[PDB]
Amino acid sequence: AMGSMERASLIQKAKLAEQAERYEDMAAFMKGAVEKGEELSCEERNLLSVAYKNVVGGQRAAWRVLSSIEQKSNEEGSEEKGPEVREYREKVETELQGVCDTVLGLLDSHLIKEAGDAESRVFYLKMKGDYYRYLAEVATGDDKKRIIDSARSAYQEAMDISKKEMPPTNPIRLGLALNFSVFHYEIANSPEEAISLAKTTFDEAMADLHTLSEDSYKDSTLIMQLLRDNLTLWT
Amino acid sequence: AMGSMERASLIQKAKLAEQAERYEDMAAFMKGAVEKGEELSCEERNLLSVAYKNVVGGQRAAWRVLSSIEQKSNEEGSEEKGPEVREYREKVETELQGVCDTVLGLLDSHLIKEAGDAESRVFYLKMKGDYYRYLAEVATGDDKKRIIDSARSAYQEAMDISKKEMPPTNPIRLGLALNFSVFHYEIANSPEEAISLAKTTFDEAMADLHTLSEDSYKDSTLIMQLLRDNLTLWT
Amino acid sequence: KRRKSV
Amino acid sequence: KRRKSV
Ligand SMILES: [Cl-]
Ligand SMILES: [Cl-]
Ligand SMILES: [Mg+2]
Ligand SMILES: [Mg+2]
Ligand SMILES: [Mg+2]
Ligand SMILES: [Mg+2]
Ligand SMILES: [Mg+2]
Ligand SMILES: [Mg+2]
């Protein structure tokens, strides 16, 4: 439905939707911009990720409230209340899966294959790992292992490039490590790997801070603080 | 699309959507429940109003951010940025008008005509005044006077019934007065009428508090505090 | 502070 | 406190 709008007007309207906190609209404008077929700039990649993060984050928070109520309904001595809680948790789960499939489809057609620079390729592979991770949070069937493996493979290819091509303070590298460590802790049942990766990533960034300008140091230390927040929570 | 769902399952799912903060879903479940054709209970009328209040409140806040950016673009010495800000403010305005037309259509087909008790009839007429008021907040054309008059007529019929049939501390009567006073202040350019109505309503409720139980007193004093908040802001 | 409505 | 992601 965005095929008739100019690329620059979609970008302009995505920024207005972010100011208005209309994240569903922001995501549909950025999806229209990606489907123009040109590569994204750094600013444009961050608009795409902020839009879908916020849409899927609302769906994930609603799914967790519904899954909690359904788990309680399934405890001994709870009354039978019919199929409605499961049906509505399914409805929200299917719309969240559809948003993840939309993002994964943009990455596969054709953002990753045209991304040659480390900043773009690592960013898109982190997004691929993140949206397979959100699929894995709701997966309960025969494909669950393969969805977890798809998240792990995308994060591992992004880690391999980031280690070779970016400094240890780069904010995309740090946020990748942060999210891969949460994948290990919450999805792969590997809390020791999660804690090792967060510790190593924090320590290697600390040793590289002396190379930075004041503004770069603020960007990097913001994400380092997220890694230390998870280490505090997990240890 | 809710025609195949049982009325009670729509009500159940509206309550789950409220817990999940999925207000668009909550409104579509309550619209399905109203279209079953039976009258609403007090609990059900409050689910309907909470759902649409939250949907339209998100749209009104986004419209005000967009209208502010468009007004700035139209100031002397601002750059021309093309039609996008006006187009997107129009897009959000048309979806907000559609939500108001949906609510007004539920009230006209057929909730008001079957509402005989004062609590239900005053509640629905307050809602009719509220959603014409939200139409008037964005109206700029030939119909603006008639949209303002439709809000005023619905609020005045609700005030006339509430004065005859409800005590001055009833929370629906108080919230009606609060919103009609905001209509006078913001929409009808009648700040003195707004302040007189808020003062009189507060004073008449204060004199009736001695008749109440502790729980009724908490309900009434909550809304009285809203009236005193507006009086502080306006005087 | 925005005016209150309910 | 929920764990952080970005
Ligand atoms: Cl459902
Ligand atoms: Cl638009
Ligand atoms: Mg063009
Ligand atoms: Mg390229
Ligand atoms: Mg490099
Ligand atoms: Mg039935
Ligand atoms: Mg009746
Ligand atoms: Mg009475």
C-beta pairs of B220-225 under 8 Å, 24+ apart in sequence: B220/B169, B220/B170, B220/B171, B220/B174, B222/B171, B223/B171, B223/B174, B223/B175, B223/B178, B223/C6, B224/B174
CB B160 within 8 A of CB B118: no
Report the distance separating Cα B78 and Cα A171, nearest Å.
35
Biggest CA-to-CA distance, chain A: 62
Which of residues 1 through 6 in chain D touch A, CB cutoff 8 A? 1, 3-6
Among the partner-chain residues B20, B58, B88, the one whose CB lies closest to the CB of A13 is: B88
Question: Which of A14, A13, A16 has its CA nearest to residue A46?
Answer: A14
CA A174 distance to own-chain centroid: 13
| Residues B201, B151 contacting (CB under 8 angstroms) | no
Neighbours of chain C (3+ CB pairs under 8 A): B
Closest C-chain CA to B183: C5
For residue A220, the number of C-alpha atoms closer than 13 Å in the C-beta half-sphere is: 23
CA distance B126 to B99: 16
Q: Is A230 on the interface with D (CB under 8 A)?
A: yes
E strand or H helix that includes residue A139: none
Which of B153, B158, B148, B157 lies closest to B123, judged by CA?
B158
Q: Does residue A30 contact residue A10 with C-beta atoms inside 8 Å?
A: yes
Tokens (6 digits) for B81? 């940025």
Which of A2, A30, A84, A91 best probes binding to B when mutated, by most B CB atoms within 10 angstroms? A84
**Which of B226, B234, B235 to mutate against chain C (most C CBs within 10 Å)?**
B226
Of A178, A233, A234, the CB nearest to D5: A178
Task: Tell me whether residues B85 and A16 touch, CB distance under 8 A.
Answer: yes
For residue B7, give the chain A residue with the closest CA. A84
- Contact call for residues A89 and A70 (beta carbons, < 8 A): yes
> Residue A77: which residues within 8 A CB-CB, separation 6 or more?
none
Cβ neighbours of residue A65 under 8 Å, at least 6 residues apart? B19, B20, B21
- Chain C residues near residue B227 by CB distance under 8 angstroms: 4
At residue A99, φ and ψ (nearest 5 deg) are: -70, -40
- Domain count within chain B: 1
What are the backbone angles phi and psi of residue A70, rounded to the nearest 5°? -65, -40
- Asked if B225 contacts B178 with a C-beta cutoff of 8 angstroms, the reply is no
* Residue A209 to residue A174: CA distance in whole angstroms: 13
B65 to chain A, minimum CA–CA distance in Å?
6
Burial class (CB in 10 A: 0-12, 13-18, 19+), B95: middle
Q: By three-state DSSP, how is residue A55 classified?
A: helix
Cβ within 8 Å, pair A230-D1: no
Q: How far apart are CA A195 and CA A211, in angstroms?
A: 26
CA distances from B14 to B3, B30, B49, B58 (A): 15, 6, 12, 18
Query: Which residue in C has a C-alpha nearest to residue B179's C-alpha?
Result: C5
**Between chain D and chain A, are at least 3 CB pairs below 8 A?**
yes
Alpha carbon distance A61, B102 (integer Å): 28
Residue A69: domain span = 1-235
**Joined tokens for residue A193:** 């790997």
Distance CA B205, CA B185 (A): 21
Query: What is the sign, positive or negative, of the torsion defined by CA atoms of B132, B133, B137, B140?
Result: positive
d(CA B174, CA C6): 9
Residue with tokens 């006209």: B108
List C-alpha distances in Å: B167 to B157, B193, B205: 16, 22, 8
Nearest CA distance, D2 vs chain A (angstrom):
8
Structure-block tokens of residue A126: 């982190």
Q: Residue A38: helix, strand or coil by DSSP?
A: coil
The alpha carbon of residue A64 and the mean position of all alpha carbons in its chain are separated, in whole angstroms, by 17
Neighbours of B193 (CB within 10 A): 15
Tell me whether residue A74 is exposed, middle or buried, using C-beta atoms within 10 angstroms of its C-beta: 0 to 12, 13 to 18, 19 or more.
exposed
Contacts of the segment C3-6: beta carbons below 8 A, 24+ positions apart: C3/B182, C3/B185, C3/B186, C3/B229, C3/B230, C3/B233, C3/B234, C4/B178, C4/B182, C4/B226, C4/B227, C4/B229, C4/B230, C5/B130, C5/B178, C5/B179, C5/B182, C6/B175, C6/B178, C6/B179, C6/B223, C6/B226
* A82 contacts B21? CB cut-off 8 A: no
Cβ atoms of B10 and B32 closer than 8 Å: yes
DSSP characters over A141-175: STTHHHHHHHHHHHHHHHHHHHHHHS-TT-HHHHH
CA B13 remoteness from chain centre: 23
| Interface subset of A 130-169, CB within 8 angstroms of D | 130
A134 close to A184: Cβ distance less than 8 angstroms: no
With touching defined as 3+ CB pairs under 8 A, do chains D and C touch? no
CA distance B199 to B192: 11
SS (H, E, C) chain B: CCCCCCHHHHHHHHHHHHHCCCHHHHHHHHHHHHCCCCCCCHHHHHHHHHHHHHHHHHHHHHHHHHHHHHHHHCCCCCCCCCCHHHHHHHHHHHHHHHHHHHHHHHHHHHHCCCCCCHHHHHHHHHHHHHHHHHHHHHCCCCCHHHHHHHHHHHHHHHHHHHHHHCCCCCHHHHHHHHHHHHHHHHHCCCHHHHHHHHHHHHHHHHCCHHHCCHHHHHHHHHHHHHHHHHHHHHC
* CA trace torsion B53, B58, B61, B67 (10° rounding): -120
Cross-chain Cβ contact B16/A85 below 8 Å = yes
CATH number at residue B185: 1.20.190.20
**Residue B111 near residue B126, CB atoms below 8 Å:** no
Q: Is A189 left (phi over 0), alpha (psi -120 to 50) or beta?
A: left
